[PDB]
Input
Amino acid sequence: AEFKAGSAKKGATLFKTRCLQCHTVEKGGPHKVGPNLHGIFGRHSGQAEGYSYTDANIKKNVLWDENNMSEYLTNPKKYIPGTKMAFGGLKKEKDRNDLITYLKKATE
Ligand code: HEC
Output
């Protein structure tokens, strides 16, 4: 449909350079300014254990899948108005496909 599986090798590099400053993916990995993302897919928003989210991220109550993750990552503040972060989004569709292909596996 919208998301198409791409390169997880490229996705791992995009995670280091675009997400890893604020997030970790390992099971039991620490929160940074943003939550640890282990188990994020197939879970509703605002539910990383031990992380205090904004009301906006909780109230969005989105069930994370690859298509809404790609829409969100384009511009988080446009998808969840009120979310607070020094991140504008991953604008290229190729980048989002590669990152999400990696993220689906890295957060399992
Ligand atoms: C690189 C492309 C990424 C990816 C894959 C994600 N982010 Fe972030 N993010 C940050 C903060 C502070 C939050 C919490 C915001 C709030 O409470 O309003 C988030 C939230 C997310 C989510 C939602 C998780 C959920 O449980 O609903 C997801 C899927 C996510 N991020 C993925 C902070 C940042 C950054 C701060 C410098 C950067 C950079 C990123 N995020 C980048 C990414």
About this structure: The radius of gyration is 13 Å. Residues 1-108 form one domain. Residues 32 and 103 are 17 Å apart (CA to CA). Residues 18-19, 21-23, 33-35, 37, 40, 45-48, 53-54, 56-57, 73, 83-87, 90, 99, 103 surround heme C (CB under 6 Å).
